[PDB]
């Protein structure tokens, strides 16, 4: 018998490492269907902000307009959502883009020549030769240009190379950054990679003590197999550190003396952020999307 309160009794969370960009947490005694759901949401359904409409005024660079526009869209912006409302597609462009629905980023770079002694460095030989993500100047407009005062729009990674130029060439554009989901385009996925791995299980069938224990220890990563002594059997110190290379099974002396399985209930999640939201925020929103999806269907009329 499964109850939602009986799930609360067995369900556990374990945080191994929680950095500003990536978080490595565990979900113990939960179903594959729920763990995979959050994983799918963290990639495809968690909304994020990325450039969508690049308006070019001039592009004399070697990099084609389409390619340069696509690169700007791929650059993750250190912009927290919820600050932006969702854009409506049916009404025209004059009503479509507002101070609540759109964020504007301008790029205006012109390349010139500089006098220096000459292989010579491009930063020495030319001025404004390399166009970076940091060169996307934030332009706040309309009713709210004070809401982003203590929050300036800056790309998550500024040193991203956008274009390379030679004197005479110029780039002039107005990029319209909007709110979108990862399912539509990978540029909107707030995660660098949100994936889980099942806890590796090493079922030792025989004691396999002695010099064979030292041979068994080398088949797994250093911090996995631990040996007490020559006797006292051969135990598994940290089965979590295992890479699951199945190296132990390709040896006649161990092929029948050991079994390699998994803990179906235990999930080891690893969530890295693009830079906009913290990895915890991305996971929390994923759980909030699954709940809202079930809630929307609850308060809904079942037609026909």
């Amino acid at each position: 018998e499964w109850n939602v309160e009986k799930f609360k009794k067995d369900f556990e969370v374990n945080i191994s490492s929680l950095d500003a960009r990536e978080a490595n947490f565990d979900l113990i005694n939960i179903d594959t269907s729920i763990a995979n759901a959050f994983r799918r949401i963290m990639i495809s359904e968690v909304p994020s902000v990325a450039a969508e409409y690049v308006y070019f005024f001039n592009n004399t660079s070697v990099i084609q307009d389409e390619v340069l526009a696509h690169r700007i869209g791929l650059v993750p912006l250190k912009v927290d959502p919820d600050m932006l409302t969702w854009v409506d597609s049916n009404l025209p462009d004059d009503e479509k883009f507002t101070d609540e629905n759109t964020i504007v980023l301008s790029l205006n770079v012109k390349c010139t020549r500089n006098p220096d002694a000459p292989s010579t460095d491009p930063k020495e030989l030319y001025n404004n030769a390399h166009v970076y993500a940091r060169d996307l100047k934030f332009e706040p407009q309309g009713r709210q240009s004070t809401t982003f005062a203590d929050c300036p729009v800056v790309p998550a990674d500024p040193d991203i190379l956008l274009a390379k130029l030679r004197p005479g060439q110029e780039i002039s554009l107005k990029a319209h950054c909007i709110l979108g989901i990862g399912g539509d385009h990978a540029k909107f996925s707030p995660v660098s990679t949100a994936s889980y791995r099942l806890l590796p299980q090493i079922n030792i069938l025989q004691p396999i003590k002695g010099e064979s224990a030292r041979r068994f220890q080398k088949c797994f990563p250093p911090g996995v197999i631990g040996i007490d002594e020559g006797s006292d059997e051969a135990y598994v110190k940290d089965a979590r550190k295992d890479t699951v290379s199945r190296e132990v099974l390709r040896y006649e002396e161990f092929a029948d003396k050991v079994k390699l399985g998994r803990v179906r209930n235990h999930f080891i999640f690893n969530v890295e952020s693009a830079g906009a939201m913290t990895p915890e925020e991305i996971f929390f929103k994923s759980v909030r999307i699954l709940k809202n999806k079930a809630e929307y269907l609850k308060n809904c009329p079942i037609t026909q």
Partner: peptide, 12 residues
């Protein structure tokens, strides 16, 4: 030569 003129693009 390329002159100053608006060219609309989708960042996709």
């Amino acid at each position: 030569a390329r002159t100053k003129r608006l060219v609309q693009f989708e960042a996709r």
